[PDB]
Write a sequence for this structure.
């Protein structure tokens, strides 16, 4: 199956459960960091929920870009948060996509991305 | 005849000036003089080119930040020497991904309090 890597700072469970429809979902501190980097390299698609500021999510996205991974960033503008210029500026509408969404439609959006 | 190129990033204003002022003792500080998606792309392109040209990356990682995290991820993938500075007094818990990236050599994470930041930078660069 496609191997899907998910990164997030109840909606996370929603996202992972729907991701499982479309592939195999991947996800002391050192072995974690090494394990996640092995999974990141094995992934066909990297999915990140980028609404909450997170050093960790950002680091995973940086490593994923350097591995030339396909990346889907999910951002909720109704949160009132300002998405990092570095993430919004990294978007290429192809290998790096930033999709704005409302909580209720997250499944329907994931279906559209992976059914296309 | 180039000095070492130092890239500073961080999400505090007095602290950032102290850090940048001290880094100027050790090299060129690339980001010293840093609204819409078009400008966001310029920021990203500019920062990524300065990151790739840097010798040392210094990041203040106390405030959670997608952008700082992303710069660190690109810096590791560029094989840059990295110093992360974290203030535990903030009450924040540093991301395990960052703490786990440390290897005590080319990627170091130092816990510090504000009064000693110049002395710590002296220790790293001397």
């Amino acid at each position: 199956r496609p191997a899907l890597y998910f990164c997030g700072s109840t909606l996370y469970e929603r996202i992972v459960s729907r991701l499982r429809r479309f592939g195999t979902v991947l996800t002391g501190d050192r072995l974690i960091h090494e394990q996640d980097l092995e999974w990141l390299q094995q992934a066909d698609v990297v999915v990140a929920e980028v609404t909450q500021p997170s050093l960790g999510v950002g680091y995973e996205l940086g490593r994923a870009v350097a591995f030339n991974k396909r990346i889907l960033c999910l951002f909720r503008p109704q949160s009132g948060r300002v998405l990092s210029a570095m993430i919004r500026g990294a978007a290429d509408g192809s290998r790096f996509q930033v999709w704005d969404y409302e909580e209720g439609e997250v499944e329907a959006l994931l279906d559209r991305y992976f059914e296309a």
